[model samples]
Target: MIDITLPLTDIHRHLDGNIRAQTILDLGRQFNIALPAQTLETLIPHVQVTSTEPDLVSFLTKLDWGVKVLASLDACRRVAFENIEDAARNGLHYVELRFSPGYMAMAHQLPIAGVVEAVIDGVRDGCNTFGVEARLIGIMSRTFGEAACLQELDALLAHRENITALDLAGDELGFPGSLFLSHFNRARDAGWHITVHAGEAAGPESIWQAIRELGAERIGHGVKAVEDRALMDFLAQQRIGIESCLTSNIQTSTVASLADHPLKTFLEHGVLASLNTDDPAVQGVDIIHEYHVAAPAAGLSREQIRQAQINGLEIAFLSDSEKRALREKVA
Candidate 1:
């Protein structure tokens, strides 16, 4: 009921994680893989369907069933298009969808470059068909080794015509930002926009390394940056932008509770944080719900939410003319 969907952008998200439940079910049947009985109804409790628990543990389990359905380019394209259609229906103007290309290929028997091309092309097709704008980012997960990351980046160079950014995510604690420094540095040197996953499960030092070592122009779940005074000072001075995912954070146990979230502190300290529904299907959230949560807990005034909308456009890897066009459209 909190409606602020007029002008919005989600700068953090995963492609495979955003597929519709019904879509997953349909694909299960099309691929002749019989889903466990009650796939949809049974999944309701695990997904972000107004549940009491915020953690996404069960949701991760559900994804295992879905990957089988996404094993082909046709399946991937259909799911990606459905996700964009849903986002546009909910009033998203622009979004950057991230995913682990290796995960897609390894699980589905796809070539790394093929998966990237299919997903990126699907996003472009969705934008054209739905009249909604979106971008794609290829992320390197900690579960994959550094060598795989180098290969992924190498593949991304050919697809740079549509690729917008490079990101490092997954398992923040076990794999530190240092593991990605070499790859991140290489991406930055090539002029690819970069963001890093830090300070969600760890502390401020991780956030520090993201900015210092990884050249993070934006951050994924930097709620813990306030834990260190020096890092907090640095974030404030740098006007660093954080892609805050409320339900995703609570679902992942990255925050104690919504009431205890540091979003208010970040805003009070002049941090340029923006709201994103990191994985809408995974967390059972949408960009609209994210705005609702952040408004009261994060001190996001009406104007501030507007500023965040504009912030997403400005910090995007979009061409200046495209940014200007989006700004004009939003204003």
Candidate 2:
């Protein structure tokens, strides 16, 4: 069970990756896009993980149709709004939703800035309607390489005030953090919190580059950090946050099994590792499921689960005052 004392939080959720299957079907029909399946029953398997993907890159393919259906800026808005609504329904006190504007706009040729603005407006509206505290993290989709990421960054830069952080996601194996140093450098200058998706597809060296070169304050799925004791010590001493998504790790084949996961080890080593639902919709699970089902399966005891919850509040991209406000609201 969650510690009622701390604010429930999910800091590593992806907005684009959480589009509802219902929304995808609706949008596909509306836009006249040729979807893989006509019925919702058939469509669910395509968008959601019915079978475990062979690798990290293959796992990401499940998220493709969700973005491809973003035929209009409102599609982006709708998806963003729904993300917050889901967060609230999951009893979240705080959530950080990250997205790649370039990826969302690619299929439809929608303007990057337009998608960014729409996503902001949608999340803002959702917060107003649902009464959940939230933040946006702009994603630099590294698979598209440097030039496209620059374009994505420019769009996010236009709305930097609304986006609380910067993230490097997608194709971590092929497009290493070394390729986008300047992009993250610009984000650092913008004073945005940095979280990179590292160590899942690659190894600790990828995680090292994320921290040393890209200025990552938090590592997304730093599962392999356990491989290097020195790196584990650095993360623990520095209190660098690790966003561990247990089910996503298994689905991506990053970990061979739940019992093989190192989340327990990270906590034991004093690393600020917390449970998260990386792509809730794609995984067909929520944060609560991650807590109740996945955590226990992965050998997290009740006390460790509580510590993970507290770790979430500690590592969340919020100011001291804002975090206090969350606790106050709980009271």
Candidate 3:
């Protein structure tokens, strides 16, 4: 059902979230840093999610080890480049890899701007080498609190030219969207497309504020929108895309089974929802798995999968002509 003739896009992947476990081992050794485990085999449990976590926070903790190994800017650069390589290997023609500069910088105390620069350079060079079209989305770690997130936004704004959009990620239920209104406001002032993490850990009200107050054009993991009819109607009527991640949702304990996923409901209701790999490294999955495996498990038919592929292009941040170019190029 994955039509190679048309472009495939991953609009919600996290750059910091996809760091190689081997790289963590390598970086730990290179920097002589103490790690939870010495060998790659033993270190995997600390860095990757092997099963469903008890909660979202528990699942998110799995991603921290990857950040801890960011001992230098080149380390950050390497991870970003490798994410591109992974995307190319997966036959993804286009991707929007998101990262939080503050999250990457906090572990190493590296300059925030340097981290952004390294990620940009890495993604740009990787795109040139692998022939996969890629763009960067800067994220603000909401759980880090407002002052810290403001600093994060400043760093992203410093390199706004390379950044495609802005996202608010991490500790969604604890923080809520209202707290980041000013942060997203700055991103909008920088002319960035807005996409917020909503409805995954919180209620539909969080999503409503993301769209109305923060100007979110797309929502990340909006699985809870099914509870509100008016919100679902609004999303469909407005063409506000929902970047759904079936495997990641289950791994994060957001859902119990793929069969009960709201993605199918969203599609049946005509909402422009599309499947994505939220954090492939953490979840141990790829977009193809989401299509060939998890999607059918969630009851998506061949036509629905194809529609998801089609919606992916519509949901992407590319301009009309750019989307057309990718479709033609892939064809």
Candidate 4:
């Protein structure tokens, strides 16, 4: 077991990505939901990409099966709570768990309001039980088109206190950030924090659009920014945080390999590239494992890793007082 000396944080982990394998199988049996594989051994290959040649489309496609199987609000709550529990177990003191309510509601034909409430309730209970502080970020899937995105925003706005930020996810190459500019602008105008998934499947132009059009405060999987010097400087000068998930990038072929990841480069250039697990369960990793990979494979020193952790704490959507307290605790 790896012993962690610094307080851990994850700013980009997905609620759908934190579901347990046994829970999926159990939920499948209880709800009579069709599953491709019943046993955990058999389910691993179907729900997760274990091959070296994994792509973004295949990795995201696995979430569909899990989402379709979760036909109840109770299951949603359990999954949400379990996400916090897993984060706590991995030594995370602070986390931000994001989910797409439209995807869940669409898959189960449930009300988006109910889905958001269940997840909020779950986060509350999980924080109380697990002793980990967390906030929620509602996700908008680009593939779902503008109507669904607005529908999710309505439910998210209904519980503004429960939702901390808004994120754009899914099919970055097929559905670019420009397509969701108005929706993101609406969310930004409503005082919501915006983080867009760009520069992973696409390039620096998508990152540019996210900043110029979508008003993204933070960037998710922005590894492709390494390809452009001007974009790198812009991110550093603007102090925009880039959520970096080493294994997920490698697994999805975003970086080609972990050794080729731009995490160290981004850090050396003074960009706030915070380490995170974009899809922990799907990638079979956690915050600690991410650190382990970064320390050796990514060539980050102890101080470098600590600063990255602090970067996560600083850029979090927490209130000033809360962020200050966390800074003291982590320091």
C-alpha lDDT values of all predictions: 0.73, 0.94, 0.92, 0.84
TM-score versus the correct structure, for each prediction: 0.89, 0.99, 0.99, 0.96
RMSD of each: 2.7, 0.8, 0.8, 1.7
* Ranking of candidates on lDDT, top first: 2, 3, 4, 1
What is residue 231's positional error in candidate 1, in angstroms?
A: 2.0
164: Cα error in model 2, Å: 0.8
lDDT of 4 by residue, 1-331 (tens): 2325445678999998777888889889999988899799999877776764356776788677677777888888988898888988888889999999888778788889888998999899999998999989999988788888889989898888778899999888878888887888789888889999999989899999998899888999898898899999999999888998888888887777677788888989999988898877777777888887654587777777777887887778888998877757766
lDDT by residue for model 2 over 1-331, one digit each (tens)? 9877789999999999999999999999999999999888999999999858889999999999999999999888899999999999999999999999999999999999999999999999999999999999999999998999999999999999988999999998999889999999999999999999999999999999999999999999999899999999999999899999999999999998899899999999999999899999999999999999999999988999999998998999999999999988887
Global lDDT for candidate 3?
Answer: 0.92
lDDT, candidate 3, at 228: 99
Model 2 TM-score (2 dp): 0.99
Each candidate's clash count: 3, 0, 0, 0
- The TM-score between candidate 4 and the true structure equals 0.96
Tens-digit lDDT track of model 3 for 1-331 = 8998989999999999999888988999999989999888898888888889988889889999999989899999999999999999898999999999999999879999899999999998899999999878999999899889999899999999888899999999889889988998889999999999999999899999999999999999988999999999999999999999999999988999999999989999999998899998888889989999999999999989998998988999999999999999988
